């Protein structure tokens, strides 16, 4: 009823297995039961499924005991039933497309879906198409396991998809995912189609060479309201990637090796500290149809990008004439005409839907530049000060924000020096005088509006 | 219905005031409602009240729209009414008590209750008792706002308080305080009584010699589950007090010049690369009666403590004998006996009610030591590389993490060097060596066991 | 009524027989009768029956009461009505099947059944297919007799079968069989579904040219919970065999000059303290499709075999390229292929129905290796003592058993040494110094896990 | 409902304590429940009751699970609410009667009554007057346990008491017990009161200084039908006592520093081929009031006996002037005048009451001499064969074993030689020759008659 050991490592319905200790559990709905999964002959330690698990549907604790022990994983793998090679493995909602850069909720290896107040502790999600699917689903608890080689959905899917498509705002609630290492899947881990309060903290986000289509270490889709603090990002097209969700706090992650480390669009999203290099981009800040959509960035350590590191399964930066650096607007996607890369596992997209961004003021058909077309400052030196101009919308608030690298050829942002408010007269211009607060060698600048959208790096000012 | 303009600085029922304006709201239960105060006359800009405004009860944004033009803000004072002289000027709910260190809901400048999506942007909130009281309400919004000289309560209180004193835990919830400064209040920021999924990032907790009784920054007291990121601490007896909230994550903040930096207790709350410095007591975690609470710390940058800062209104360190340092266990606190410093104001605690912490293995009507007395590894220097010894449970997992600093003669943990796993054998010991990543001067470490429970720091190991 | 005089060994309805005897106290079940059956005439004394005797149905004593003063037995002989030569004379439930390796409970001399508390004292049941039937018939008593020439069944077969086949465990319980000669019967004894917590102790079974099919002293078929104690085991194909039989206490035996002298299998079968010396193979572990039973030996002394005993009538070993030795696993029987002898009178087994053992570990339709696999661990001389390494699942207990043997060039184990308890660390290893209790020729080892299984002998180190 | 993880020691009603797991089985009588044991802190492992566990009334498991790890036991220990010192802790059922050779049923430590199918794996039963209470009660599992300084009713008691003290047959029977170590138990284990088809093997019972009183190894007292195979025993007043128990099969066992190895009554009980050395009586035959008792010794090697070993708690040998040797008829106990040493604690037998050995044949008011008085055989030298005489009833059936000492002054059984049968004439005398089968330095002989009564061995003749 309550406490259920899995001491044998058999795909069946006897006493004993991951299996029934599930359906055991599921037929008491209203009990929280602790589901202990034992070390059983010799490491490494896995349940070979031989067909999809039941979905959970109570309030469990699935606990791989060993990593209490010694700290090693039991895996649950799926690739006895889940046969393929690499993408091809997992088909989407529409069978011929395939992947992990389409819409999927197939083929996962556990089912959280209409239920809450599940944990799941010291196991490795092997080999599925969808790790864990966390669907309609609140209150749960992911840590201290491994989730690798999950080639469709993603590693972890939190998606609030009602059944029919839409998103939905109440269902996909304060789930936490804490000190887990995400190995080599395709879409490391969704917040997807409202889910939203959740935090996402203190994980490792990897992809290497084996990954068959490295996408994004996370992707927020339509995902909203959501924590993404602490994490460490590797290697992907895109280390994080928001399409269109809204109002997220990503904290005090590093992002290096992808192709960008921040690829944004999204009303109300903040990168706040984060530390982002080695990256052919660091932060990109797409057009999107919301002309009103502000991203906002603060404090953060964007340095040494430019890498030669063109990897695009559904994001990333491959064309060949693209401006690098810092901060950089206007960049494609998937969406977006000019992209360069693979737009998902046997998708084609009709170039008359492709979107384009606009380059002239009054043009139609286009998107906006993001960020309401905010320019960057203007930094000159000025008898031992810098002096900073500000050029935006009349009678209004900027923050501007310095930052100094100690290489003075470089025109990143290598560490925060602080900042000021401005306010704007009535042509729009602000000056102001600022000491650095060190002696070092470039400084550069950005602004952010009163609206919270923030502005690319002025060049960088040389001192002596 | 919509959109209400506040142009008179009045306080009176009539168009134009603020009190009119959340009175009209007030009757669209249902419409979501912009208050937009403007400038009014010369800066400073405030609206002096003269009684209590009416409780909010539509889901409004009450906007100060000056910040939106040169960031200044349009306070809400209360010194016209809420008269007294420090926390003397603020009752608590028994009348004879008084001050921010006892239970008291009263005097509030802004009430959040029974009511949700609020947001508060360019205000600041001057002179109340509390400043802003959140109770049994959620996704509500304050940010670009001030909050100051707050005496009573705390300047933001989030509470699920039932009314009768009892928390709840779905109440109080989802809400966001970002871009705040909180100056000279008593207590900066409360989460108590069961508010839950809360998310306290990148706002400036500071109090000066202003400051009648400098009690925490933030306290969570019966708070849980919610997030602390990016946030500093300046001046107060304890930066962040937690007493007996469970399974909070506070990560990447700043705690200085406080008597204490982190005063901890409460199953399930993890520190997360905090900057800890120029505190007498860096993380101190206090003696509970729940003896299976486990607090956990994780690649903390804790140094230059010690410091002779003894302020003690309801935490912080006074005990003149007290063990000082980085991490520090059995530390008093109000309900502790040894305790030096205000219990609040206008209270007497009975000698009979306080806590004493177990010195003696048997010893009996105390609190165990807490983190289940885990004891600190043991660091010698063994062939050019650095050898650790773990003392714990036998058969266990336990994660030693490495800390260097730059001064031999430092104790502390000043910069995080990276970490290993081990498992101990059937006496409860393991080994290893370690090679230091840099050429370093002192080395410290320390343990968590497999239930999140961390060490203190060994003894410093100098490398010569 | 309650004691009936035999003095008559013709066989009639008429007062004095036999037969008349047992007629009579049929006719008062409620009666506890003693039947005394008298000298007559001159030995040797037999009763020549010329039909099957009735069924056993009060709890009877027949006592032989010859043997009370001289020690002869007064035998009970079917030759009469029994014909046929060898075990030809006994067909099976099957007509076409014949013998004593077939499902059979004909021709008995006999019958013990749906009645309880029967004693049998003083009698040689000579020449029947089964001596004595004990068929859902507990408590009952067979002591100091002769049980001899039975072809068929068994000299004594103790069976639960409900009629149909099947088993039952609670119908064929709580007997005794003590000091007998079983000579010449095809299986001398056995106990075979359900039937349980007997005791069979102190009896000489032994097999001689004479005998047609020489098959198993003992067999234990779905036999469960009995005692099996300080018997001998001479000459016949195994000594004592176990097919699928749960839990049997095995000790203090002697079996020599069998093929075999233990062929085991089944769940919870202890070996404890046995002579098994003379045969081909000591101990024989089938593989069985019960992949969870664990056979134990302990204190076993096993020598002097590898013997060419190749005699394998529904066992022993036949196979010309077998690994010989005191313990050996995989050794196939009637139910294997490879194996080598009759699979019983007048059955053929299908090709497609015999079994294989696993030889790689995930190889499909095969009987896993025995115990669990379970390696022999590794002597090594180290400065004048024994050193033994253990190589198996990790954190668990082992025992590991030492034997000496005083031929150097000796293999097996002569004479138990002593025994430790060792604990394998993460990778399943322990290790363990061990110093001769006396000084000895050659050393041997085994190990049994935490769940009863032990494995074969180590390699002999030879101490020099 | 099936498994309850026990991971706390102390002793409340609360989750994860031994009692809950107990109260949780108890309350499903119907399922079969494993409670599981973990090792909590430092071994040694310990839970300390502060009151009597609730009877086991399910049937469970109790499983100290680190046995399986490292073969340490986890202890329930009663020494916090049994207070006393040694024996006097413990009330008989009259409680001015105390320790363990009174009736007594009184404060166990698990209780396993109306109840049947439960199994104590991986503990130590340590502290309490009967560790553990088997009272009608059957099919019962024991082993891999520890039964420790239980100074009450014995380490292990199977009684069929019926609660007014009369025996039962049906159950407390077809219990194992299997290797445990019973330590400083005052009775190690209890076969009483109508306990019946148990088996006892491969058990170590052992007294030290510490035990407060010694007494019996094993005590069957009306016990009947048992098999008690392959146990060691040392150091108690009698190794093995029976007290008018009847028909147990006594086997194999090795008895060794008692004051008397086997001190024996009841009509029907077997000593086969056990090892009894370095007691001061080797096997004693009291006199009794049965007097058709017939108590059979066959195959025994009894030597090295005659030690001067003093130690009475309710059995063994004080009488100075006893006569010593391998087999002695007539050996005082508690119930016979003339005997010397405790009648148990807080005892007096009236003189009136104690029971006397008829010395002469036609006495009144007394035991018959046991074994129906049965002659051991004259042994002499004739032409190199040995000529023996036996001197018994006529007309009947004996059973000469003759045994060889290779000390040529020892007149007791050092090893076994072999056993003829010879029966008498009309006078009670057989004569017959018998080559010894080695060249060997004195030789002893006894007789069985046809009851089954063995005799006394024969004075020693000596080879030259
Ligand atoms: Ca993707
Ligand atoms: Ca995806
Ligand atoms: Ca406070
Ligand atoms: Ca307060
Ligand atoms: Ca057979
Ligand atoms: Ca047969
Ligand atoms: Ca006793
Ligand atoms: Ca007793």
Same mark, same amino acid.
């Given at each position: 009823a309550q406490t259920y050991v899995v001491? !044998? =490592? /058999?795909?069946? +319905?006897?006493?004993?297995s991951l299996r029934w200790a599930i359906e055991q559990a599921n037929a008491n709905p209203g009990e929280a039961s602790d589901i202990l999964i034992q070390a059983v $002959? @010799?490491?490494? =330690?896995?349940? @070979? %499924?031989?067909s999809a698990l039941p979905e959970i549907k109570a309030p469990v604790k699935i606990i791989g005991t060993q990593w209490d022990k010694t700290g090693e994983y039991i895996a649950i793998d799926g690739s006895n039933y889940i046969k393929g090679e690499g993408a091809k493995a997992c088909p989407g909602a529409n069978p011929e497309q395939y992947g992990t850069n389409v819409r999927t909720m197939t083929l996962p290896g556990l089912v959280l879906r209409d239920v809450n107040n599940v944990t799941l502790k010291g196991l490795d999600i092997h080999r599925?198409?969808?790790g864990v699917l966390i669907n309609r689903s609140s209150n749960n608890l992911i840590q201290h396991n491994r989730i690798s080689?999950? =080639?469709?959905?993603? $590693?972890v899917m939190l998606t609030g998809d009602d059944g029919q498509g839409n998103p939905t705002?109440?269902?996909?609630?304060?789930n936490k995912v804490l000190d887990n290492i995400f190995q080599d899947?395709? &879409? *490391? %881990?969704e917040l997807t189609r409202?889910?939203?309060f959740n935090l996402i903290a203190n994980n490792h986000f990897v992809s290497t060479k084996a990954n068959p289509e490295p996408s994004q270490g996370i992707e927020i889709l339509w995902g909203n309201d959501n924590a993404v603090v602490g994490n460490k990002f590797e290697n =992907? +097209?895109?280390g994080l990637q928001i399409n269109w969700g809204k109002r997220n706090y990503i904290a005090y992650n590093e992002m290096t090796?992808?192709?960008?480390?921040f690829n944004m669009t999204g009303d109300g999203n903040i990168l706040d500290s984060n530390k982002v290099h080695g990256? !052919?981009?660091?932060v990109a800040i797409r057009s999107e149809k919301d002309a009103n959509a502000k991203i906002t960035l603060t404090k953060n350590l964007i340095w &040494?990008? *430019?890498?030669?590191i063109k990897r695009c399964?559904?994001? *990333?930066?491959?064309?060949?004439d693209q401006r690098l650096g810092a901060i950089v607007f206007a960049?494609?996607? %998937?969406?977006?005409?000019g992209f360069v890369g693979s737009?998902?596992?046997g998708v084609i997209v009709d170039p008359s839907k492709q979107q384009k961004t606009c380059? /002239?003021? #009054?043009?139609?058909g286009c998107n906006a /530049?993001?960020?309401?077309g905010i320019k960057a400052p203007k930094l000159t030196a000025n008898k031992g000060l810098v002096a900073v101009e500000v050029n935006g919308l009349p009678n209004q608030r900027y923050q501007v924000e310095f930052f100094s690298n100690? #290489?003075?050829?470089?025109?990143?942002?290598?560490?925060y020096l602080g900042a000021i408010t401005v306010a704007t007269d009535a042509q729009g211009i602000a000056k102001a005088n600022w000491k650095p607060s060190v002696k070092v060698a470039s400084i550069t600048a950005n602004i952010t509006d009163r609206f919270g959208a923030t502005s690319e790096l002025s060049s960088a000012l040389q001192t002596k």
């Amino acid at each position: 009823a309550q406490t259920y050991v899995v001491d !044998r =490592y /058999q795909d069946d +319905s006897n006493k004993g297995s991951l299996r029934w200790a599930i359906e055991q559990a599921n037929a008491n709905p209203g009990e929280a039961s602790d589901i202990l999964i034992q070390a059983v $002959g @010799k490491a490494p =330690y896995a349940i @070979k %499924l031989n067909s999809a698990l039941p979905e959970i549907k109570a309030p469990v604790k699935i606990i791989g005991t060993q990593w209490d022990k010694t700290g090693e994983y039991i895996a649950i793998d799926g690739s006895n039933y889940i046969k393929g090679e690499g993408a091809k493995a997992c088909p989407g909602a529409n069978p011929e497309q395939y992947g992990t850069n389409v819409r999927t909720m197939t083929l996962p290896g556990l089912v959280l879906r209409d239920v809450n107040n599940v944990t799941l502790k010291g196991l490795d999600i092997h080999r599925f198409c969808i790790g864990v699917l966390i669907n309609r689903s609140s209150n749960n608890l992911i840590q201290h396991n491994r989730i690798s080689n999950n =080639y469709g959905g993603a $590693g972890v899917m939190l998606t609030g998809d009602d059944g029919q498509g839409n998103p939905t705002a109440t269902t996909t609630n304060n789930n936490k995912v804490l000190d887990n290492i995400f190995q080599d899947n395709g &879409d *490391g %881990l969704e917040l997807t189609r409202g889910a939203a309060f959740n935090l996402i903290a203190n994980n490792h986000f990897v992809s290497t060479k084996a990954n068959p289509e490295p996408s994004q270490g996370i992707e927020i889709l339509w995902g909203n309201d959501n924590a993404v603090v602490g994490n460490k990002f590797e290697n =992907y +097209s895109d280390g994080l990637q928001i399409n269109w969700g809204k109002r997220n706090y990503i904290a005090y992650n590093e992002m290096t090796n992808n192709s960008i480390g921040f690829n944004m669009t999204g009303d109300g999203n903040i990168l706040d500290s984060n530390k982002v290099h080695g990256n !052919r981009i660091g932060v990109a800040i797409r057009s999107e149809k919301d002309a009103n959509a502000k991203i906002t960035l603060t404090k953060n350590l964007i340095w &040494d990008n *430019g890498k030669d590191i063109k990897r695009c399964e559904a994001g *990333g930066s491959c064309v060949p004439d693209q401006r690098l650096g810092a901060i950089v607007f206007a960049v494609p996607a %998937l969406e977006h005409a000019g992209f360069v890369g693979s737009r998902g596992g046997g998708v084609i997209v009709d170039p008359s839907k492709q979107q384009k961004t606009c380059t /002239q003021p #009054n043009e139609q058909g286009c998107n906006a /530049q993001p960020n309401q077309g905010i320019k960057a400052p203007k930094l000159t030196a000025n008898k031992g000060l810098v002096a900073v101009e500000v050029n935006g919308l009349p009678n209004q608030r900027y923050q501007v924000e310095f930052f100094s690298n100690q #290489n003075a050829a470089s025109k990143e942002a290598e560490q925060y020096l602080g900042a000021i408010t401005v306010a704007t007269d009535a042509q729009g211009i602000a000056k102001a005088n600022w000491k650095p607060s060190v002696k070092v060698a470039s400084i550069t600048a950005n602004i952010t509006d009163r609206f919270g959208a923030t502005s690319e790096l002025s060049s960088a000012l040389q001192t002596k």
